């Protein structure tokens, strides 16, 4: 258990890039148009339209959920051919040439620097949050495992928080520093370069994927903490019995046979829930949706809702498994459907009390605190609890392109939908929550 904090915190270093990556376009919004548009002037003399002006940043942030679809998608290629700690040690390529392509955006005059910057990281995140949840699971003891796999969800909002503070004007948010906020990630990237060669291969891979019985136990033994590892090393040859026992269906023959197709319903609708409900339009946009209100101090806010979405993160934990998964879901829905008519409500009276500022805080406060209750956790406690070891593979990787295309929906149209509804922007969340909590209430069972 000594030697394991080491291979599990620099795994962790991933899903704190990952968060962070997430949020970091949340405060910088305002200084990075700006360059934009002094960009648009240079090549062509002329100021940018503002519809273009927003379908470009829109993009800008949304293309890094396209990469993550791709990445998710590829996790199991380098997963099972070229192992869990080595595939985290070279895909910090990526990160380096996203640092690059985006801290070097501005010196170069090139907004397509930071949208394939922006594409690269997401390509890598993509892939991380396949890596980290398996490899801590694959390194844990089965008892401290359940308790060491919530390090990712917080590597996840912690992230976004460390993102949202360093995009103060008085630190990194600024016209000067906005290219190295973007590019701070090599300093995690060059940390996880220098811990993981020391961090030791996962055993599973080493057992099942590669056949060395024998050196496996080498790694346990270290890993740990006890001498011996009978027991243990059994346990893997166990349920590597009951994980190839049953054919490992794939993405074809899930749509296909009808036995899986409303399992599989089921899973997506809760991704689309978990998206389409509208959290990335907080945690790309509330700096913005904040200024649109009367907010002082915007980022400030931002920073309250990323603590509020960091405290309630804990607390879920022991609740999730303190009730039910049918209620916690529910209750998030109309949380959430709650802080977005709260938020049109302060939204609305604001033009006419100058003090509903306010309330909108309050609101989305309570909009992203639900969610880390609610549709943020319960969507991944239920399609691993819809399909056995055979085809629950399948179901993730659908599920993947079902999180990212919601993902991708919200944040590049978003800023399409938020210039026609004007204050009535949340309606449409409203909406959506509602008819997840209505399918949820009758076509989704309990487990
Ligand atoms: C079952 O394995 C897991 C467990 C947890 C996670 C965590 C995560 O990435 N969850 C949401 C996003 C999210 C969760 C909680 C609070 C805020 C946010 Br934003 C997610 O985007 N997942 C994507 C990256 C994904 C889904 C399926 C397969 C790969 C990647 C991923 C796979």
Known sequence: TGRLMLAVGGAVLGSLQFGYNTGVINAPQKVIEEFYNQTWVHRYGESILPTTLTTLWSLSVAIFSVGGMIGSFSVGLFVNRFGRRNSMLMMNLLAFVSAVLMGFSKLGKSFEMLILGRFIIGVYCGLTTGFVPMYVGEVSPTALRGALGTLHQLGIVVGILIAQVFGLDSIMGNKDLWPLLLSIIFIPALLQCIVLPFCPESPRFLLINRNEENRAKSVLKKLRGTADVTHDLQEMKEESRQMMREKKVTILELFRSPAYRQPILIAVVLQLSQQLSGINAVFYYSTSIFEKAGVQQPVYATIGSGIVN???????????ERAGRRTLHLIGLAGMAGCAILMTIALALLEQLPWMSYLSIVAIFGFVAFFEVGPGPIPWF???????????????????????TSNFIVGMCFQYVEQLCGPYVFIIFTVLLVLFFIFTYFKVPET
């Open 310 to 320: 960091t405290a309630f993160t804990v607390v879920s934990l022991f609740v999730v």
């Open 382 to 404: 239920i399609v691993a609890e819809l399909f056995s070891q055979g085809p629950r593979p399948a179901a993730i990787a659908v599920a993947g392109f079902s999180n990212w």
